[PDB]
Amino acid sequence: QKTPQIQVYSRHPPENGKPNILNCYVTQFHPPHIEIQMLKNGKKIPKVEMSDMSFSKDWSFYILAHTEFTPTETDTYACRVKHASMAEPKTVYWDR
Amino acid sequence: NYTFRCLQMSSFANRSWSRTDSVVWLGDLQTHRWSNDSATISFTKPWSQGKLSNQQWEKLQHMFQVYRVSFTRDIQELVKMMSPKEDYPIEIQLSAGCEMYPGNASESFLHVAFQGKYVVRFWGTSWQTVPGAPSWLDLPIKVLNADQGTSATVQMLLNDTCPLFVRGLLEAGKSDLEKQEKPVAWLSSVPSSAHGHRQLVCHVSGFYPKPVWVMWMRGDQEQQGTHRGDFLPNADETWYLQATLDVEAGEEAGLACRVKHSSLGGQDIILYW
Ligand SMILES: *[C@@H]1O[C@H](CO)[C@@H](O[C@@H]2O[C@H](CO)[C@@H](O)[C@H](O)[C@H]2NC(C)=O)[C@H](O)[C@H]1NC(C)=O
Ligand SMILES: *[C@@H]1O[C@H](CO)[C@@H](O)[C@H](O)[C@H]1NC(C)=O
Ligand SMILES: *[C@@H]1O[C@H](CO)[C@@H](O)[C@H](O)[C@H]1NC(C)=O
């Protein structure tokens, strides 16, 4: 049993009011059953693309979530993960 | 120098629930997916069939379809043979394929993990448990090594088919595999874990292929405090990476991030703080 690491990053340099993509890469977890949500000001973003699940040389799973977004000055973004290795959901905020 | 790997992920939650999903990678590009939901393997590239004819592909796919159904029932029957030592939920992973060297040389591999831990491989002409594998596997592995038809098939796949197929992929997928995408870089800061410090961050994104150089600089002096992070995939088959430098307050001035990449052809990106 293994705890997911979560990293959040934009595809392009963030300019306010310019379209961009926000990525949430979740790694190092086991077992493969996992829920990933991306959040805008604490609400779930509905249209989120997921890559196929895969795994590394060390057998730990990984998967990429991404979504279209255009940043602003006041909007805050996060990626929240529910997994059986954690009694609580882990949330990682986008750095900016 | 490419590694072709077919990855299978099988989950068994109880006697009535299981799914098996696969993905195939040639280096860092995905060539196939095979969801539990589809009868057929799906291509994720225009060149995913390699140089094989539709006849050869159908025959290969057909064998995997047989295999997936047989795998699923074999494992669930093996649960009841060794219960209640190890009960549900059960996770199995297979990683199989070949490493392609220059001069038309290759090494093939077939590795299996149980509950996230390497336990079995195919080697030469037989399946074998690895040292430290649980001893209840020794009998099931003998049962399987008695199936000489499976053994000959797996031997064909590893010795002939795998390097054959991959030679074709490399030819047919040349322009994607040899693609060059240019990095775009930008600078920012985030809080440091130490007091009176700021963490300078140099972000580099959209580059392909993977190899890249990124350093914080003060003139020609490389800043040995540069902490390079992991390669993180973008969703468009390019790479993302960031390098950080924790610096005292006031000492930021004069710093620069410098990026080298094969797609820039000597023309390094240099950003200044
Ligand atoms: C597939 O390749 C392997 C080589 O890895 C062959 O297995 C070897 O066979 C030789 C000669 O028959 C044996 O003396 C070796 O002990 C085997 N190697 C190992 C590492 O155990 C295998 O015969 C080949 N099969 C086919 C169908 O070509
Ligand atoms: C089997 O597992 C699935 C998925 O975890 C679950 O939804 C289902 O209720 C289980 N069924 C039985 C009979 O245990
Ligand atoms: C996976 O596919 C098999 C075979 O088609 C099917 O019967 C099984 O119920 C599927 N499992 C899930 C969880 O959808």
For the purposes of burial, counting CB atoms within 10 Å of the CB of B27, is it exposed (0-12), middle (13-18) or buried (19 or more)? middle
Last residue of some domain: B151, B178, B205? B178
B174 & B233 share domain:
no
3-state secondary structure chain A: CECCEEEEEECCCCCCCCCEEEEEEEEEEECCCCEEEEEECCEECCCCEECCCEECCCCCEEEEEEEEECCCCCCCEEEEEECCCCCCCEEEECCC
Ligand of minimum distance to the alpha carbon of B151: 1
Resolution in A: 2.5
- A64 contacts A51 by C-beta, under 8 angstroms: yes
Residues B145 and B237 occupy one common structural domain: no
Residue with tokens 């805008």: A40
Last residue of a domain, one of B141, B161, B178: B178
B87 and B108 together in one domain: yes
Asked whether B15 lines ligand 2 (CB < 6 A), one says: no
A13·B184 Cβ contact <8 A: yes
- Three-state SS sequence of chain B: CEEEEEEEEEEEEECCEEEEEEEEEECCEEEEEECCCCCCCEECCCCCCCCCCHHHHHHHHHHHHHHHHHHHHHHHHHHHHCCCCCCCCEEEEEEEEEEECCCCCEEEEEEEEECCEEEEEEECCEEEECCCCCHHHHHHHHHHHHCHHHHHHHHHHHHHHHHHHHHHHHHHCHHHHCCCECCEEEEEEEECCCCCEEEEEEEEEEEECCCCEEEEEECCEECCCCEECCCEECCCCCEEEEEEEEEECCCCCCEEEEEECCCCCCCCEEEEC
Q: Tell me, yes or no, whether B166 and B234 share the same domain.
A: no
Pocket test for ligand 3, best of B11, B16, B18 (most atoms within 8 A of CB): B18
* Contacts with A, B 121-180, CB within 8 Å: none
Do B206 and B118 lie in one domain? The reply is: no
Among the listed residues B162, B259, B126, B163, the one whose alpha carbon sits nearest the alpha carbon of residue B205: B259
Domains and CATH numbers, chain A: 1-96 (2.60.40.10)
- The enclosing domain of B272 has a CATH number of 2.60.40.10
- Burial degree of A43 (CB within 10 A; 0-12, 13-18, 19+): exposed
Is B150 found in the same domain as B37?
Answer: yes
Q: Could you tell which of B109, B125, B150 is best to mutate to test the pocket of ligand 1, judged by most ligand atoms within 8 Å of the CB?
A: B125
Say yes or no: B135 and B147 in one domain: yes
Same structural domain for residues B148 and B190? Answer: no
Q: Are residues B186 and B174 in the same domain?
A: no
Experimental method reported for this structure: X-ray
Q: Which two tokens stand for residue A23?
A: 């990525």
Is residue B183 classed exposed, middle or buried when 0-12, 13-18 and 19+ CB atoms within 10 A define those classes?
A: buried
Which of B134, B157, B178 terminates a domain? The answer is B178
Same domain, B156 and B237: no
Q: How many domains does chain B have?
A: 2
Domain co-membership, B198 together with B240: yes
Residues in CB range of A8: below 8 A, 6 or more apart: A22, A23, A24, A77, A78, A79, A92, A93, A94, A95
Q: The domain containing residue B98 runs over which residues?
A: 1-178
The domain that holds B127 is classified in CATH as 3.30.500.10
Contacts of residue B141, Cβ cutoff 8 Å, sequence gap at least 6 = B120, B127, B128, B129
Is the domain of B18 the same as that of B143?
yes
Q: Which residues of B touch A36 (CB under 8 A)?
A: none
CB contact under 8 A, B203 and A9: yes
